[PDB]
Every structure is written in structure tokens, then in C-alpha cells.
């Protein structure tokens, strides 16, 4: 499924993201924005063995787990594939958990300079709400 800026913005609102730990949306727009554009299959590969499923891109070797992945660990306890649900809930639901372990979003790439270090209203700016 896809989420346009509006919609998502009302989603990661219901879901409590805005703000949440000070990630504002700006934060998880501009992010999601370039990885996957708000998109429930934008699906991405790691070399490494891994493959990277939902929304906001999340491996399923250290965030999340396949069952193919190739060795896995898993540190969300989640199935990649629930966050390709068609409502953010999934993955945000493993991000809420994932923007808790000591490094938070400083890894997935697109936000790391995209977004940590450009702008966060880009991403909001006219979903005024």
C-alpha cells in the first residue's frame, strides 16, 4: 500500500510518531520519504546477506526477520513482512521499538544526511496538522 503526505501524517499522528522521542514526522517524512517514499513494498537489498522490508526500510538481520535472511538475529522480535501491512502500524510499532536502542534512526542512510543535517518542514509543510 502507499501513504501520501497527508495520510501519513494523520497515520504517524494516531500512531503517536510526531515528535515521538523528538523524531518529528519532518524527521520520519524526509526519511521515509527517499528510502521507500511511504510505500508498504519499496522493498531494498542488503549484500550482506539481508534484505530490508517495510515502510521505513528495517534489515531483517539486526531490526527485523524474514526467515530466509541468510543467518539472522533480530533485535525488534518482528516477521519483516508484517511492515509491509497497508497501515504503518506495523512498522511503526517495531520503529517505536527500534528508536530505543542507543543508535536510533542514525543508520538508515536517507535520514542519516538527508534529513539529520538538511531540513524537517519539507516533509510537513501544507498537512498542517
Do not use: E, M, P, Q
Given at each position: 500500500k502507499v501513504f501520501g503526505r497527508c495520510e501519513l501524517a494523520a497515520a504517524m499522528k494516531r500512531h503517536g510518531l510526531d515528535n515521538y522521542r523528538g523524531y518529528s514526522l519532518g524527521n520520519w517524512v524526509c526519511a521515509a520519504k527517499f528510502e521507500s517514499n511511504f510505500n508498504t513494498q519499496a522493498t531494498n537489498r542488503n549484500t550482506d546477506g539481508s534484505t530490508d522490508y517495510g515502510i521505513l526500510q528495517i534489515n531483517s538481520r539486526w531490526w527485523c526477520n524474514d526467515g530466509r535472511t541468510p543467518g539472522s538475529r533480530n533485535l525488534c522480535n518482528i516477521p519483516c513482512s508484517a511492515?509491509?501491512?497497508?497501515?504503518?502500524?506495523?512498522?511503526?510499532?517495531?520503529?517505536?521499538?527500534?528508536?530505543?536502542?542507543?543508535?536510533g534512526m542514525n543508520a538508515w542512510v536517507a535520514w542519516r544526511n538527508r534529513c539529520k543535517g538538511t531540513d524537517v518542514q519539507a516533509w510537513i509543510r501544507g498537512c498542517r496538522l
Open positions: 511492515l509491509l501491512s497497508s497501515d504503518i502500524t506495523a512498522s511503526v510499532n517495531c520503529a517505536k521499538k527500534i528508536v530505543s536502542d542507543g543508535n
